[PDB]
Amino acid sequence: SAVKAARYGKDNVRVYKVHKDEKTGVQTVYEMTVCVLLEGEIETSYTKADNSVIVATDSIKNTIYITAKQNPVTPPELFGSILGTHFIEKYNHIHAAHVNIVCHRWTRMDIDGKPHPHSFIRDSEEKRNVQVDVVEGKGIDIKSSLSGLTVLKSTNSQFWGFLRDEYTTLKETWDRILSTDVDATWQWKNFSGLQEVRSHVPKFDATWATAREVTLKTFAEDNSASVQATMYKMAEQILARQQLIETVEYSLPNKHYFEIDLSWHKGLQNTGKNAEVFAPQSDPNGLIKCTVGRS
Amino acid sequence: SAVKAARYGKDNVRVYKVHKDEKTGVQTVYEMTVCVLLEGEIETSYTKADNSVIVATDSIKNTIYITAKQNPVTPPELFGSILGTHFIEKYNHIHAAHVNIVCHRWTRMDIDGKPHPHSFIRDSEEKRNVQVDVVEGKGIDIKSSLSGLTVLKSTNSQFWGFLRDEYTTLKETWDRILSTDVDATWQWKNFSGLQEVRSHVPKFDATWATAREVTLKTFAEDNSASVQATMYKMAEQILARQQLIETVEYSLPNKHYFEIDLSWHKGLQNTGKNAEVFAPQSDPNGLIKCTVGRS
Amino acid sequence: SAVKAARYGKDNVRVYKVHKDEKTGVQTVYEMTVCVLLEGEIETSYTKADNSVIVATDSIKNTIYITAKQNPVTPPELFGSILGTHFIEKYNHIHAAHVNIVCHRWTRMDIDGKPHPHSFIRDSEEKRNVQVDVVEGKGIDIKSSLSGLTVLKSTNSQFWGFLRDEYTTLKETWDRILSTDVDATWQWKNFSGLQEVRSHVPKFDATWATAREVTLKTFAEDNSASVQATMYKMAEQILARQQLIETVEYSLPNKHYFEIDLSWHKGLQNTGKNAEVFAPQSDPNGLIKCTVGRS
Amino acid sequence: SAVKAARYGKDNVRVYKVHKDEKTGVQTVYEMTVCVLLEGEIETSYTKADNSVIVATDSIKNTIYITAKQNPVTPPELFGSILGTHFIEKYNHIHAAHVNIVCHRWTRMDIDGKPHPHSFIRDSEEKRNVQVDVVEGKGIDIKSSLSGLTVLKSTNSQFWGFLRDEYTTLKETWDRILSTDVDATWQWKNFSGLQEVRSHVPKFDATWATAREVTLKTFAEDNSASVQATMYKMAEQILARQQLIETVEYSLPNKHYFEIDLSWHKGLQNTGKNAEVFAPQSDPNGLIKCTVGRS
């Protein structure tokens, strides 16, 4: 036997950082969950009980905190890049660092119409994420995403004209509910290293904003032919707006809301045009994916 | 043996309702999870395999949908009261109905600065809940709450002057982070029945708003001596503002954010006044509760 | 305003303990999650920012670990009683301690047909729990339970003869699946204090065993008329077998498994006697409860 | 823009099947969660609102139930292969089917020392899974796994001799707790199609058994130098025992159990050789991975 692939490190590292403007009194908080997994000439830790080649996962954990202390933690693409670069540079025998960051929302509170200097609210479980692969000799590969963005529209969703055969029961509809949890990922052009990432720093927050904005507007305004057609419109607009991204991926569940026939009860009419009360279905769910690039 | 207590019914009933203004095109959605448990002369279903006294939980489920079809689902205190009243009136041998409702947020989207007529976003897992106990001969007992409201303040929290003995290691602090998940409950004066509930309908949304507002403002503005002292200030203000509530309950976890001593590494200073990077603790957590009434 | 009720302390305290037989080499592990909430003359911590009366929740946490170090952690009824007794005795102004313990399973592994001396497997998320209320002047009130015991029987469950009216759609059935998550609680006679608890120590593991055994056997062997009738048979047998318990409570979801009509497809027969493939329903679910005591 | 990748279908399809021996009265149950995602000439559903090429996810759902009705659902490698093969054969323009199956445990109950004919218990959340990729023209790629197998050993785990530098605080230890959630995957040799899968059917249950057995025995008996070294021993034995598998992957969290220094309290000794009470850590956790193949 032989080791074909190996990576190890520390997962679920919770991190908070605060910035305090002693001038204005305004504080700003950041909270994330970090995973760092290393690759390199480590196969003998597996095959020969050779721990000498292991940078302890506890030490990886310390390094995450120390790096947060000494560097910006925003945007997460930058923090991820600094952290991964540290491991491959610091340790000769480590040749890749895989950095995953989940950013948790802490939105400044408005109290009586004015932003509060140090109080925050978690306005949803929507996350901003990065996946940063720092590979010695091959630069920095970054995937950015938003996830957990849950939306619903009550009309202007349709689903008709699909294939019909002996396995098909679904009725065509020209007016349905559409609800999903948006998972959207934009893949950056390969960066040659930390310097190139630094040179593009303002583009990270901006592209996240754009992706978020395009998603919400297209969802709200598209009179949707299908989840497939709607998600494609989102991806093409994001690509059009950021030349440094190579692909946009969407993964969308179709979280079904079923009509409830109540005509068996006093002839109550609750279907089609009379549909008022629906049963949200927890499972099963459609799952629709696509990766869009440029022609 | 004998049955000392019994209740049965349907839990986790997911319900959606839409309202459509055909005049304006504006749609409004409501989504909830409902539980209805009945009590009454049902002990022989347990002791004698006498199913004749059972209103099927499947029928309870149907009844929830039918009631949503034929009545307002807002405010949830009213819907809960109508639903519970239905069971005790419809079935002679049913003498109490216990209605729990969790309301899920669907906040209208703003697209390019304007509210969209039929698109919504789940802006957090914060819930609005009710517990409605409809008891034949003894009216309607309503508990209203907000839960899952997650907040953090980065300063203006303190914890010193607590009891110190041989079990105490905790250092006194005059400046810490405070973060919690707010669970707040206001208990209404007993209502004599559905008519009395109806007579107070506008007070339900208003008192929820007040509770929410008082919570957020007191959290943001109190230079907190402890979770105990802060939560009491919230409760007393809510009581002061709604004479029809008898008590206000808070249940607050203290979600700890620990300083990280980094002085072992290149003498980095990250404690006290230099504290920038913290480790959020998933567990354990303080849990602080109180029920406040009027003197 | 005034404080009507108050309790505070530390929740989600994870605890492991190991016992090592240096003679035999056999080790035994225990793992739990503990919550301790105190009551007493603490209202001024809420109303007057008077922290002097607060035994820090961090100190409560320390005390849980120290108590585990110096006392048996099994049975959990005893450990809970020692822990609660400690707080009301140690602190004059603390008058009740509320101790909740969740015990996690670590079952010794058998390797090649022989029990291993120090390796364990989590054979399910079923828990053994206690709720121990230690109230100064009023002894120790103990509720013991098993929860998360998930079972299914594929036949010998029936549900017919229930009330039928205009809200009823459910078909009567003489052969269905029954599946539940068993939550069963036995309430002990009040104990006067820690000494009385000590005097009954062997009865705790034994009564848990009995409850577990009666549950599984009655579930497997009862040709069930309903969840109600089956659960009552469990409770009455447990009561018959332990005079020191006053009541037995069951809370059982009916986790529905629906037939799937496939006759629309090539006349496939998959209902009634031909029913082979079913759709397990995640929600809604029946929820059936009863508290049984002696006549 | 252009579609670079696309797949769509139905996720979280819960399925139960029962087998009844009318001769013996013995029933056997199977329960799973299924996801089927299709690929093919479907890009115009995304780019042109062309639903004609969509096999409805609702129809995919029906097909899963119908396939379960008409075929064995065990072993899951076979069921997955039949299901995926169906889509690529039935639909000319569908060229791959991705079938993920999670199998839930329903272990026959023993009642008074004898196996019960139709009653079952969920003896843990451990799963048996498959990932079956059916690709037209390129056969069937199968990955089998066990996951959620949670174990602990109380001694005979060590971790010393690892790299020490200015980021290292962790003390070397020659006796620690080791606990993990085992995720183990064996990758089968490519199969040319459904016939080849059929020809190996008995090897699926057998290799799952072997993997399970090797995991538990190696965990219990290895005096572990590290998670890395232990997991490698598991993988090499599995490979040695099934020539038709090409690689074995492990993904293991190191679920840390920390010593608790209690010497600050009455000089209590609870570290090193005196270590009895530990604090299980929910996060962070080590995460150790490797993919082992043959030399």
Ligand SMILES: O=c1[nH]c(=O)c2[nH]c(=O)[nH]c2[nH]1
């Ligand atoms: O937008 C949809 N896409 C599908 O592929 C599909 N399939 C289905 O049943 N409903 C829908 N809806």
Ligand SMILES: O=c1[nH]c(=O)c2[nH]c(=O)[nH]c2[nH]1
């Ligand atoms: O606000 C607090 N209340 C307490 O009761 C307590 N106890 C503790 O350890 N920290 C805190 N903080």
Ligand SMILES: O=c1[nH]c(=O)c2[nH]c(=O)[nH]c2[nH]1
């Ligand atoms: O055992 C049952 N009890 C009920 O009360 C009930 N109600 C229902 O719809 N199914 C069942 N099954």
Ligand SMILES: O=c1[nH]c(=O)c2[nH]c(=O)[nH]c2[nH]1
């Ligand atoms: O078995 C281990 N492997 C590691 O790589 C590691 N790192 C760490 O901190 N503890 C351990 N333990």
Ligand SMILES: [Cl-]
């Ligand atoms: Cl779908």
Ligand SMILES: [Cl-]
């Ligand atoms: Cl606290």
Ligand SMILES: [Cl-]
């Ligand atoms: Cl039921």
Ligand SMILES: [Cl-]
């Ligand atoms: Cl580790």
Ligand code: NA
């Ligand atoms: Na390197």
Ligand code: NA
């Ligand atoms: Na009645």
Ligand code: NA
């Ligand atoms: Na006392």
Ligand code: NA
């Ligand atoms: Na095909």
